[PDB]
């Protein structure tokens, strides 16, 4: 596999139109009133080349493993500054849920993930609007099984919602974690097992240190497996 990520943005971004919208904003921000170009958030999205009139990954349609398509993207800070004009704090819920889903889908794809500012301000400011329990209850619409390759990513972006993210997935709760370790080792789902390891380790349920009985299992299961052993040794020597 290669570049098999979510890839929300399907087509090229309307450069010229975006550039036009990019103007009249510096002095505006330093000194929305201009919304005649794109009336609605759907129009703003399709302006980004977001989607051919779409917000849920259809895994039956293999939407979680797309191709490169070599598409261009506007600067992510400009994207998240334009998207945050159609916020409408005091509005209905059926539109705010669409806003939240559009934000979550356009934070998880590879293009917006591998093209982000070193210092994150907008990402933490947008998440701070919704409720953490609401952001993770109306979760990123990925199935619970493949929730971990994208959950590692969501925790790479926002690392503070890990304990608040395994509760909704597993509902002490360590029995479910240990049972879900199986049916991943029982099957040959090692990749999802690796990302499950990377997602759960360090929480209040699977802390670091030499002390969990995963190491024994792996030692018995023995090219993608080696990395599991190395990561487990590293986490034990902490």
């Amino acid at each position: 596999d290669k570049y098999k990520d979510w890839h929300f943005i399907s087509k090229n971004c309307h450069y010229e139109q975006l550039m036009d919208l990019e103007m009249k904003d510096t002095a505006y921000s330093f000194l929305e009133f201009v919304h005649l170009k794109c009336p609605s958030i759907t129009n703003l999205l399709v302006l980004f080349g977001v989607n051919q009139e779409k917000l849920k990954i259809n895994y039956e349609k293999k939407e979680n493993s797309r191709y490169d398509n070599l598409c261009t993207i506007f600067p992510v800070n400009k994207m998240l500054k334009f998207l945050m004009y159609f916020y409408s704090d005091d509005d209905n819920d059926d539109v705010r849920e669409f806003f939240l889903k559009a934000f979550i889908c356009l934070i998880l794809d590879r293009k917006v993930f591998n093209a982000m500012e070193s210092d994150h301000r907008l990402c933490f400011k947008v998440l701070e609007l919704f409720n953490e329990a609401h952001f993770i209850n109306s979760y990123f619409e990925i199935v619970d099984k493949n929730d971990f390759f994208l959950h590692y990513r969501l925790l790479q972006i926002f690392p503070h919602l890990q304990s608040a993210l395994l509760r909704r997935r597993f509902s002490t709760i360590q029995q479910n974690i240990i049972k879900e370790f199986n049916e991943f080792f029982d099957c040959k789902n090692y990749k999802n097992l690796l990302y499950f390891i990377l997602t759960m380790y360090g929480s209040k349920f699977i802390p670091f240190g030499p002390k969990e009985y995963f190491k024994d299992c792996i030692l018995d299961i023995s090219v993608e497996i080696s990395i599991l052993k190395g990561i487990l040794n590293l986490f034990s020597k902490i």
């Binding site: 990520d5 971004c13 450069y15 550039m19 990019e22 103007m23 510096t26 002095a27 921000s29 330093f30 000194l31 070599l70 598409c71 261009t72 993207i73 506007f74 600067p75 400009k78 590879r110 293009k111 993930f113 591998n114 093209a115 070193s118 210092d119 590692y152 990513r153 925790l155 790479q156 690392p159 503070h160 890990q162 690796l194 990377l198 380790y201 360090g202 929480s203 670091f208 993608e224 990395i227 190395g230 990561i231 590293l234 986490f235 020597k237 902490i238």
Partner: protein, 488 residues
């Protein structure tokens, strides 16, 4: 080594030794994962040793735009769907934003102090020399037997060369506006981010050095020490007797100013071999509009100017500093001369149209009043705007005089031939007055403004008519509508 050095404990010694041993085997992936997999957890703050902060600074210069095979051969799996340079920069930024917040309601009052010492033991090894000191005798750091990180030599070894710390600054300030792919890229994903980190570290090491010295000392000695300060050794790299003209031409290196000195900077060479070359396999995906490049470039330049003004307004009313040979009173004139004598109105806005109207104070109103008192001088007074930033009436009571003395109004000496240059000059004054007024309200929270408002609106008539006097299809750059809104 007496101040700021804090000894480690047995908990941190094992961490340091494990990290250095992981780095010895060129296993940088695990070196990053060790620090990343414990950031948003309980209050422990696994702190990086300086011998690893240096490896991070050198890894962060291994961008994927020119070195794809090295990165792809280091860690084939790439589980994080990222690159070492993108990660190392994230960790650097994360620990730097931690360092800028010394709170006891966070990880620890000792690990924080152990990080502050570890970041200050790393920038000290970078001395601005004009164009292995290991304090921890408890482990064998992996910089004794290693001077090359995957091809890139190092950071302190490559910057401590003859006249190399200044080429690293003058080589990123000219590719920050580039309309070419490898040049701009190199100064977008590598040095622009890295240069803002460094400047962020010298701007607090200087605070450590200044806040922790010899309290209650004579001016003569006080100012004699200020030339030995961390920042002062950083300004030395400029190596110029005439700071005022050198600095100003060294800050704006690819702007559209008047260019009065033909003897400009020599064609700058890249810091690392192949930095100015794009690899065939990598395909960029971001479409950066020229406005975006100008915004980022002018942000970095304004940051450099502020970092300058950091120690220059510290020197008391006594003698000037001896090390940098900086005047600190007419270097404002040199910078405000390069701003007024511009040729682009977009770049002139993006300099003063700052996002942080509070983080960069104390020198923008001094640079806003310096350009306003230079365009009038050369194109149709003793202003006091900067001095009236503590009186709502005073500044309001003096702006009338200008507009009332045909300041921002067009003249009759020119014709319709040079209307542009005659329009740009009054358009440049619009940008400078707004900034001065914007700061006023913000720093201050009747008829005074009313009177001033009317005057500004009545001065538009001349321009409006001036549009008909020169038979224009459209109007002139008015300055009433933009001001009215501001007052609310």
């Amino acid at each position: 080594g007496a101040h700021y050095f804090v000894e480690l404990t047995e908990k941190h010694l094992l961490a340091f030794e494990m990290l250095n041993s992981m780095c010895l085997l060129e296993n940088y992936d695990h070196v990053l994962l060790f620090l990343e997999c414990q950031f948003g957890k309980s209050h422990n703050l696994a702190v990086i040793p300086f011998d690893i902060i240096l490896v991070l600074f050198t890894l962060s210069t291994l961008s994927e735009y020119y070195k794809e095979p090295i990165l792809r051969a280091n860690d084939p799996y790439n589980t994080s769907r990222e690159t070492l340079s993108r990660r190392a920069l994230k960790l650097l930024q994360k620990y730097l934003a931690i360092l800028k917040e010394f709170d006891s309601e966070q990880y620890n009052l000792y690990d924080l102090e152990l990080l502050r010492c570890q970041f200050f033991l790393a920038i000290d090894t970078l001395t601005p020399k004009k164009q292995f000191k290991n304090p921890y005798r408890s482990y064998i750091s992996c910089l004794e037997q290693r001077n090359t990180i995957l091809g890139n030599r190092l950071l302190n070894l490559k910057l401590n060369e003859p006249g190399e710390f200044i080429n690293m600054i003058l080589w990123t300030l000219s590719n920050s506006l580039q309309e070419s792919t490898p040049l701009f890229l190199s100064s977008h994903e590598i040095w622009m981010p890295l240069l803002e980190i460094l400047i962020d570290l010298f701007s607090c090491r200087q605070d450590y050095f200044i806040q922790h010295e010899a309290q209650n000392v004579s001016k003569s000695l006080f100012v004699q020490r200020l030339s030995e300060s961390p920042l002062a050794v950083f300004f030395e790299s400029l190596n110029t007797r005439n700071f005022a003209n050198r600095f100003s031409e060294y800050v704006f290196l690819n702007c559209d100013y008047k260019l009065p000195s033909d003897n400009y900077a020599t064609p700058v060479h890249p810091v690392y071999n192949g930095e100015n070359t794009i690899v065939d396999t990598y395909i960029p995906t971001i479409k950066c509009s020229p406005l975006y490049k100008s915004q980022k470039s002018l942000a970095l330049r304004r940051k450099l100017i502020g970092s300058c003004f950091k120690l220059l307004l510290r020197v008391p009313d006594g003698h000037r500093l001896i090390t940098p040979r900086i005047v600190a009173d007419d270097v404002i004139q040199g910078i405000s001369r390069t701003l007024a004598s511009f040729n682009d109105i977009l770049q002139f806005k993006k300099f003063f149209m700052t996002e942080n109207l509070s983080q960069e104070s104390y020198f923008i109103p001094l640079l806003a009043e310096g350009t306003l008192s230079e365009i009038l001088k050369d194109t149709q007074v003793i202003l006091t705007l900067v001095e009236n930033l503590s009186d709502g009436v005073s500044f309001c009571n003096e702006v009338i005089g200008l507009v009332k003395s045909k300041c921002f109004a067009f003249t009759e000496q020119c014709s319709q031939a040079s209307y542009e240059e005659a329009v740009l000059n009054i358009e440049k004054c619009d940008v400078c007055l707004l900034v001065l007024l914007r700061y006023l309200l913000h720093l201050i929270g009747a008829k005074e403004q009313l009177e001033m408002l009317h005057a500004i609106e009545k001065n538009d008539s001349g321009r409006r008519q001036w549009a008909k006097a020169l038979n224009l299809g459209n109007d002139p750059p008015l300055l009433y509508p933009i001001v009215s809104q501001m007052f609310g």
